[PDB]
Each structure stands twice: as structure tokens, then as C-alpha cells.
Amino acid sequence: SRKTYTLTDYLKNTYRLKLYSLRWISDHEYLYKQENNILVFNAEYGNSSVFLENSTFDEFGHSINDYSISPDGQFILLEYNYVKQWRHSYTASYDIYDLNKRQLITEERIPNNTQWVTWSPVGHKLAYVWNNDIYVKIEPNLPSYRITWTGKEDIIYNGITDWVYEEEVFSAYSALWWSPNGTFLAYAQFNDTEVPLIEYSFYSDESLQYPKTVRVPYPKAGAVNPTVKFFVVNTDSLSSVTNATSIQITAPASMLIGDHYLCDVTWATQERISLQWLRRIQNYSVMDICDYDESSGRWNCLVARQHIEMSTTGWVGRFRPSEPHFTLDGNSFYKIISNEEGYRHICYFQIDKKDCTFITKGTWEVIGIEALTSDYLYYISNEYKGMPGGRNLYKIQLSDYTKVTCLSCELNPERCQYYSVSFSKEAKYYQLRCSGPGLPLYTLHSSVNDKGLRVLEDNSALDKMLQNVQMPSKKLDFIILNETKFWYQMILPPHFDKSKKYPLLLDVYAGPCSQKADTVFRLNWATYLASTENIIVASFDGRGSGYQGDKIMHAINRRLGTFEVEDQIEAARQFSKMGFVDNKRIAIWGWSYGGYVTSMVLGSGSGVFKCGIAVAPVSRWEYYDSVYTERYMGLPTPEDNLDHYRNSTVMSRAENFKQVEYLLIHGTADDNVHFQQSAQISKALVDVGVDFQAMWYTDEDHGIASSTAHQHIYTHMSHFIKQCFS
Amino acid sequence: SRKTYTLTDYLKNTYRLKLYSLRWISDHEYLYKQENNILVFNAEYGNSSVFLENSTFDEFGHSINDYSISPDGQFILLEYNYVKQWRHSYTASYDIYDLNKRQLITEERIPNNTQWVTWSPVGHKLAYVWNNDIYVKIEPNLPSYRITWTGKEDIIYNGITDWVYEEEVFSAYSALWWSPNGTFLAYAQFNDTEVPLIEYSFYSDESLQYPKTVRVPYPKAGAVNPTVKFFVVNTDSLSSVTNATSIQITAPASMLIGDHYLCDVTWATQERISLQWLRRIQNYSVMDICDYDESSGRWNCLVARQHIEMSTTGWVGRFRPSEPHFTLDGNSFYKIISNEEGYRHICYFQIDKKDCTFITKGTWEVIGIEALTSDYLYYISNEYKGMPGGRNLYKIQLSDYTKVTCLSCELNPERCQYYSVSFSKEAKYYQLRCSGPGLPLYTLHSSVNDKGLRVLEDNSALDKMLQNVQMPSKKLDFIILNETKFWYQMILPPHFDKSKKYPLLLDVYAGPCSQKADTVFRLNWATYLASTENIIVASFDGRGSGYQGDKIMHAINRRLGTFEVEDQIEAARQFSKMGFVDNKRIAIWGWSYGGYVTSMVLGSGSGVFKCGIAVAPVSRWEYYDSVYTERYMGLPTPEDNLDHYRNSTVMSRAENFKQVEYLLIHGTADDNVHFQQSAQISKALVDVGVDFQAMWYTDEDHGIASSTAHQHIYTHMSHFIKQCFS
């Protein structure tokens, strides 16, 4: 009939998804920014007004890529001169616009090249980092107060994370946390003094005669890690002639005994803060609860009021220990932890009591706690229909755990099976975001009766466009591997005929706690391969997968590169045994961890796969960062796990590549997974006489996301797959 | 018929060429090494004896990769622990062996990591460089005399060249010159203090956790160059307590006025040395002839003995001003210079007279002066049959320039048209080396009558093998473009049929003063392409080509990337008009300058070529080194030749690559043509949306010559060509 979803539709993004990104400014109003003007909406009735006109800054003389209204409704922080750094960090220029007098504050403005900026939770206080030092501005137009003086590029970081903490433990650039009402400002300091540096070339624009060398503090497995220190300062007792005084919170002793990390800071009350520490051997973590001492000024963390979280089967937390949610009086909290059965559920704690109480249970897991009222506890879980790849919002009554209600399950079971949620300040209202299996659906509700107020966006426009295109379908099912069931998904070509034999591409990631089989609606490269090239694209969640309990997830503990690749191979082998797969044309590909798995599978000598594509893969764990690698592999020492670090490299399987067609791709400026990793893969293949294909992307990083490089890499990969299958 | 010359034959070197490398130790004898022992031959009769048995060093305990017998016959220098650096430079360990007492010297031995070592020209003195300083040994077993104390890594070089001087001017690591009888030791000192560094990553073995950054002083076009100083020391006037005094030889003023180079040093007599200096604008060069002053100890270079060499059409010399050949008394000399008609011929000079007298003339060129007696001057030229691609030995009478005799022309006109020669100490005997077009043939002759004494090697063995294989044929001919004729060669498939239409591969280099069409016999990749794949491999010498006079060579002055690439297109366009060429399958490939040209040709938008391969190409001249680049391009300033520098880049033609299949290959540790150059090419292609093939070779340099890499790249390229043509 009509056309198919082509490679150009994907690259040029002709079929666009509509979103509904709102920013709650209260328990009743949210701002719905548009391509032009920002509106303010009344959640209850839906009426709206204009918060500030698009023309308001026609003559700002700079392109504004982001705004950040103070919790005051009094000021607007304007971000411009954006310059991306790593995955989360970046620098920019900031201007404060006074909403009152509609004037642009021109005095004592924030420095250019500022690293981080954030308002206080309540007032209009400002805290920012610049040149690695922390500054506080009690008033938009008032002079700033330097809180720290030790900041030093690539060495001492105050209020901001270094490379590894940004990527692997905080997933943020910021390392500062205001107290509930803004009185205190807590921050972290990182010392990269002896951390080795990764060095690589950056060629820049053509006009650069000499390539520059980029050097950054990056600790590879087994190397010297950065050290951290926590501090708290009172933003009210700050003079303007005396240097602010920061109180350091240290220990615990079970942590200070060796290398450790700071993996979480959460304020309980206005004078109570919780901190979670993790040993370098991420087997054991400790939460300290510290209270402010009025007539002392310092903070005390009572031993006995601390809680230990450890595992004997694997590491702690999914990626790190979960975050606690404190009750009004801060004398108790709720947090996700692994069951005695290995399933993650909500445990209820009394700050001075060792044993907690699980308020949920079952062979499913709580993905996260979304909101806590004195009445109910709202959380997301994959309980419904026993599908680990589904996400639903549930509320449990704190007075009767026996009373848990599903708020998303039945809204539209056919179209919606994967939800995310966004509550207002007091959780009076909430916005549900459905992202599959049907077209993304955004709606608004009220917590009191859980009444559906209205549809914010149903993507009806895209719906109309897609009915004139031959789209692929998605199969989400499971297979059985010795007692246990493992899920998978397959993007099936239009007019799928189970009688016919199709070529198959295994799309892989498979890193610990990952999930490639779900109910999410996507418009990606796989859509095109299936719609236009009639290729089945499958993904399988084997041992190591998350959201299914620890027996499965911790199965690859200390053994990266074993079961998770073997299982990907076993899936393929079983997919071909379903009858609609041409086992002479089965390929595999992945990015980053997926690149590692792809390479390991292709070098396994299974002969199952004809060809494969590895994009920015890890080739050996000693090349990757410590925080992530060590979490699963332990330490690369003969006393610990060295032997396996050495047995799970790609280069040792070089000889086996003689049987396959391989495409190795990598960005030269990858700061995460260093080009080095592929450099060594290609070298081992050359030393063994194996022919293969390669492609480097100069000055591109781990995402290979610039507009041009992105279109080029997927175009190159399409050709490779088409050639391998035709 | 039987079999063909396969890719494996080329890669595994199954069909070995034999050589007869001899070393003249006197005017009557020479040394001829064997895989085992070294023999000594009597040129007159041919009888030989063993100089030193192979077993001699059975239990040396070290793999010796090179020997060096003193011009004494008394000692043998043993080279081991060899470690390569750039094209000519390398470090190693050295042990001396006393052939007199057949003892291994163990006292005061040469240090490890020695950068260079050389015997004096007559006795058994030794001069070596270590840690950038010069040392002298009057006796193999005696304490060494330090000569210099300024040596500093990557900064000050004594006795050895820096990167650019090694590659572009001296084509050697060595920068020290012994006087004829060994009395004086002259050397050059290089200062790279402000020379920018090229930096690139070296991955090393898999075990290396953090990649290393290599940094070498390398001046790119227009950058700050290294400065040079010259000194001469009397190695007979050394105490053992006094830090020997080096006498500096400075200027000339016409040189000191700005940036310049030392491009040649030649000793005239025991007390007369000659130096040649060149302006950074390699248009003007001054030669100084200096004399040792007995009651001064210093050296004086009399203006009046200095000769100037300059050019108005281009640069001076083929790659540098030619070297002088002095008559016994050092009162006059001969050297190859450009004619008034633009052809290089031998000119005769009186050391104190400005004007010289050409002793040869014609529309052909003297390639080199090989020997000089009181009676004759022997030289190589391409006069015979008027074909620029042939080489023959000639001897001219000093009494009558009218009497020039060809000593190789007729020895075997069918088999031999390309000669080189090696004279004995007093030119009483000489060995001729025919390297094509037939199999290489080595013979001996006596100068008195020019009588052939005997055949040294005729490669009869290799001849027997090759008869049982279908070898390709070689056609050397020319075409005519506007009055002028340009030569070309084609490797033709076995049983070539001018009626049939064959696919054509244009093997290109085309650098200024290059020659790809000659009568040399070669067993290489092209041999495989033609023999086994039936592909015609052609090469064309257009504008910029050498050995045909300046009109042709200087055509591209200040204009690289113009006529030389255009002509290569014209040649293909001309070949495809001979009838035995499938104009639908014309490919092109090259290395270094050939890579550059191939890239410019593929980006020309000519429509003539279907695909191409560029290996380690130059992409824009500002990225290449100053000495070579500025020699033809001048300086990259708006006051000089900047506009053309910006007009001859490969990336400006990115768009046009849409019409061809391109393969970009580059070693990552290329210290000569930096990976950066291919990195900017790939970026321009990505940014323009052009698809292509690439392949990097980790830790490989300009030659990509490691055993495995070499086999790998030719295998990869073969697949590419085969695919493009089948």
C-alpha cells in the first residue's frame, strides 16, 4: 500500500512525537513553556494565563536555551552561552530578570563560565560554582559570598563532581544540596590530586595547525580514586568581611578504614541530614543520620542511629543504594531495598531501629518511590500482569499496607503499559506519562479521588500521519531457560508472515541491571530496518538483567562477560528455532556495553552469528572507570579478581573473528569509553590476520550525536547490514 | 597454463630476489656477507677466504642485527638491542670485538641506548652519540672523550639530526662527519627550543592501562624552525682532562640575516671542508669552503671561495643543493647544477672562481657523479635512447669533454636499462647493478679497460621458478601533451590482449621530482593485481615529475595540488582511449603524496574514476613539515602564498566525493604525515554527508610495515579493489 518508515524518515525525523513538559511551581500551578511564550496553568480547572511573553527578550542580545524561575515567582534565571562538557556537566552565562519591576538586574551579576547554579528550595537565594569554588548570593542584586577557596582546576572540586562521580554515582554535575528552607547549604569536595589522567587528541576545526591534547582525571579499574569530604555551612550566619565557616561531617569508621565513596545525601528536616557511604568494595554501605547542634554549631551523627545495607550475593542497590524518603517529623523513612527473597521492595524504618518493615512484597519489584504524603506512598512498579517490562503507578495506604491501589493499570490497558509520573509540590495533582506500547499519552489527575482531569496530549497528529505508513509491530514475550523465564521483544516487519524466514538483527546492551525488552513505543533505527528492510530486530533480557530480582541480576557478579553474552547467544539460537528466521542471516549489534557483548559473542566461536557491529565498545575492563567496573568485577589484583579481568577481554578472542564479518566504530573524542578500547581490538585482529571493517569519527564522543555524525553512522551501519543480509 | 603470482606470494615473499651486497675494504678487495660467515674477495681473480666464521658469536648471548667492521679490518662493531625510531634514527647497544686477539672488549664499552656510532674513515677510531652528546674513542678499549655537554632531550641535538632534518634534509640520523684520514670530526648542533610539538596517543601493549602521549618537536609549515650551529674538533689534540675544544664555523651573513638551514657538508681534503647553507626560502644557497689555520687552530672560510646557487623558476636542487666532488688537491670540484636550458649537468669549479664550465649538456640529466680519478669522472644519467626512466654509467675524459663513453648501455640492452654502481677505494674496480627491466644482474669490472671480470649474481634460480608462473608484462612508453612528451608505464596481465577491455588501476605518487615510470623490475602488489586479477596497473609522470629538466619539474612551483593532479586525470582520460581499458572501471590509489593526489583526483569531479584508495595522505599543507612543504609552497602568510595553501586542501572538495567510492587508511602513530590529516578529511566528508570506507592501524607509523599490518592492509585493499571492479 502506502510507503514504509524509511531511513530518511528516521534521520530527518519526519514523524515527530509530541510531549508535554510542565514545570510545577506549586501544588496548584505549573508552567507549560512553548516554542515562544511561557504559560501558567491552573491544574484544577485548566484555565491558563501568560507568565511572560516570547517577545520579552527579543533584544536580549543572546540566544537563551533555558530559563529557571525562582521558587519565589519573583525572578527568572536566564541561561545562555551553553557549552557542553560531559554527559551532565556544562558551563554557561547567567542573567537574572526581576519579574517584579520587569527589569534586568545588571549589578553583581553571576560570572561567565559558571559551572552550576541553583535557587534555594524556598526563597530566592542563589548558590553557584565558578572556578571550582562555591558562592552564595542571598539577594539577586547583592554581592556574592565566597564559601570556598580551595577550588583548583582538575584537582579540587567544591560543589561539583569530577568525571567519575558525575557519570557513575550522582548522574549530575552538582554536589551541593540546600536544606528544606534554605538555611543550610550542604556540599561535597572532591580531590583528584593523584587520580591518573586519560589523554587523547582533539583535532578541532580544520584551521588548527597542531592537534590539542585533552587531559582529564579519570580512574580506571584498580587505580587511585578521588577522595571526598562533606561540609555544611549556615547561609544566615554569613558576614561579608569574615570567611564563612563550613562544618565537616566525616566518617563512619567502617568507611574510613579504606577507600570509600559518598553515594547519597538527603535532608530529613531543617536540621537533620542523611548521608549514605559506600566502601570501594560496593558490597557494604552505611547511612548516617546527623543532627544540627544549636549551641555548638556543628553536626552530630549518632552511631546506633545509622543503618547498614549490604549484600552477600552481589553489590548494593541497583546502581547505588536507594534514596530514603523521610516522614514529616524526620523520625522515620521509607526506602527500597532487596528482599530476603532478592526482590526490591519498600522497607519502613525508624531512624534508631535496626530492623525495618517491608510494606510490599511479591515476585516483582518497586522501581521507585515517587511521592510520600503523611497519608499515602506513591510508587512505580512492574507488578501488573507479572510483566517486568511494564511500569505502573500505585499508592499504598500507610495505615493499612493491605490497601494498595493501582492508579494507572486500567486507564487504557491496550495503549498504555509503561508509565512515569510527575506530582505537584504537595502531591495534590499528578501528571501521568504513558510511553507505550501505543502512542505516548499525557494526562492530568488529582490525588484526593484520583480523578482523571484531562488529556494534556494524546499525539493524535502523529496518529494521523502514521496511518498512511506501513509500520512494524512489536512482540513482547518470554522463553524458558531451566526453570526461569527470560523476556525478549521483536520488532516485526509489516505484514509479518510466520511462514516466511526473515533475517534477524539482535539489538543488544545487556549490562548489569539493564532491560531491552519492554512496552515502550519507539521510533528508531530498528523501526526502519523492520518497516523498510523487512528485518526482524530482537532484544533479549538474560542473566544480569534488572527489575526481576537478584538471583537473575546478581548472576554475573564478579563475572562480567560470561552469562550475559552466552544468554544472548542462546536467545538467537532459540529465535531461529521458532520457524520464521533464516538462520543463515542472523546479526548482532550494540553500543558501549552492547558493543562489548556484541564483540564477545562474535568472538565466542559459536558460529551462530554471520556479522556484527560494535560501536564504542569496552574491550577490557581495566580500561574502564573504577566506580562502574569495580561494582561488578571487584578489584583487578591477584588477591581479588585479576584472573577474570584477564579472561574477559575481547582481544583474547581475536582468532574466533575469522568466522564473522565485523564492523568496528568509535568516536575519537570519547571521554567515557576511550578510543583506546577499540584501538586494542583492531590491533589484536590485525596481529591475528582477521579482516574486518572499521570507522572512526573524529572529534566525536560516546554519543556520536552531532547532527552530521549521527546521520552518517546510521547510514554506514545500514549499508553494512544490508550487504551482510542481501 | 600453470599458476599466477598470488597475493600470498607477495605477502609471504615466496619468490625471493637475490642481491650481491659487497663492501669494498680496499682498492682490490671487498667483503661479502652470507647468512652465516663473512668472506673477503680478491676483485682481480675472484678467490676468497673467510674473514670471520658465523659460529664466532654463537654464545654472544644477544641477537645481533648488524655488524660493522672497522676500515682497519682490526675490529667489529656488534649492534644489538635495536629499537627503531623515525625513518633513519634508532637506538641500540654496541659491543666491540677485537679481531686481532679474537677477544671481546669488556672495558670502557659503548653505553646502552646509543643514538649513533661510526668508525673513522681509516683507522679504528669511534665517535658515538649518547643522550644527545658526542663521544670519541681513539681506541676501542680506552676511556671515551666527551666532546659536547649541551645535549638536552627534544631540545639540543649534538651529532644527530632532529625530526625534520633527519627526514627532509640529511635523510640520516647522523650529523657528524669525519675528515678523510680521521684527524678531524665535524658535527652539527640542532636547537629545537621553540619548535612546536606534535602530540598523539600510543596505545602500546594490551597490558598498558593508560595510553601514552608521544610528543616530538615538529615544525609544520610556517612554524618556528630549529636553528643550527656547526663545529669541528681536532681529535688528536685532546688531553683526557681538558674538555676538548670545538671550533665553530658560523655564517655566512647572507644566511644569518634570517631563517636558514645547513643542507650539506663535504670534506675536500684533510684540512679543507665545504658547507652548503640554504635560506628558509629555498631559492638561495651559499657554499663555503673553509681551511684549517695551523697557527690559529681555527677555521677560516674565505669569501671568494664561496659559491652561490640560486633559482628564479623554482627551488635549488632536486631536493637540496647537490653535493660537490673535489679533485685530489681540493683546488677544484664538480657538481650537478641546473642548465641555462633547465637541465641538470655536471659543472666544473675552481674553488676561488665564480663561474663554472659545464662538461656535459643535452636534453637529458646527469643523475649522479659516482667516482673521480685524475683521468676520468664517472656518472649516471638518463641519456641513452632518450628515455628519462633509464639509468646508465658513463665516463668522461677530463682532457676532452668531447670524449664520453657509455660503460653499461650495451652490456645487455634487452635485460638491462637501469644501472647503479659501486667503485672500489681508488676506483680500480667497480660493480654494476642492473635492476631491470629484466631480472637484476650484478657484475664486476676493472676500470683500466672496463673489462667484465665476471658475473656476481644473475638470479638464475629465481628465473627457473618464474617460468612456471604467469607473470605480467611491463610497457614503458609516452604520450604527448602540447608539444611535450610525458612517460608512463603499465603492468600488463599475462596474455594481454589489446582487443579485450581490462579494468585499470592508476598507481600514483606524483610528488615534485618523482618518477613512477621507469625500467625497474619489481615484485609487488601490482604484480599480483595484474597476474592473478588481470588488472592493468598504470603510473604516469606529469608536470612536477623529475629527471626531465626544470620546465617540467618547476611547473608546480608554489602550486602543489594543481597540474600534477590534473595531469594524472588527463593520463587516465588518455588511457581509456587506447581501447583496452574499461572506462567504467578505472580506480586510483597512492601513499603519502600519492594519497594526497588520489584524494584531490577523487574530489575533482572529473567522472573518470569509480573508486580510490588514499593511504596516509596529506590533506592540507599547513599540517605538513616546513622544510619539505615550504620548499615548493613558500610560506603560508597573506604576504606570500597563503591563498594557494587554503586552495589546495582535500576537504574543500568533500562534496564531490559523492560521486565515488573512497577508502581512507592511516596509521595512528604516523610521526610523518600525522593521523590528524586523515582525521580532518573524514570530518569534512561526514559534515557533508558523504559515505566512505576507513581503517586506522593502531600504533603503526608512516610505513604500516609491521609484518601483520603490512599483510593486513594489502589484503583489505585487495578486497576493496576486487569489489569495485567485479
Ligand SMILES: *C(N)[C@@H]1CC[C@H](C#C)N1C(=O)CNC1(C)CCN(c2cc(C(=O)O)ccn2)CC1
Ligand atoms: C557504555 N554503556 C559504558 C561502558 C559500559 C558501561 C555500562 C553499562 N558504560 C557506562 O557508561 C556506565 N555508566 C552508566 C551506567 C551508563 C548508563 N547511564 C545513563 C544515564 C542517563 C542519564 O540521563 O542519567 C541516560 C542514559 N544512560 C548511567 C551511567
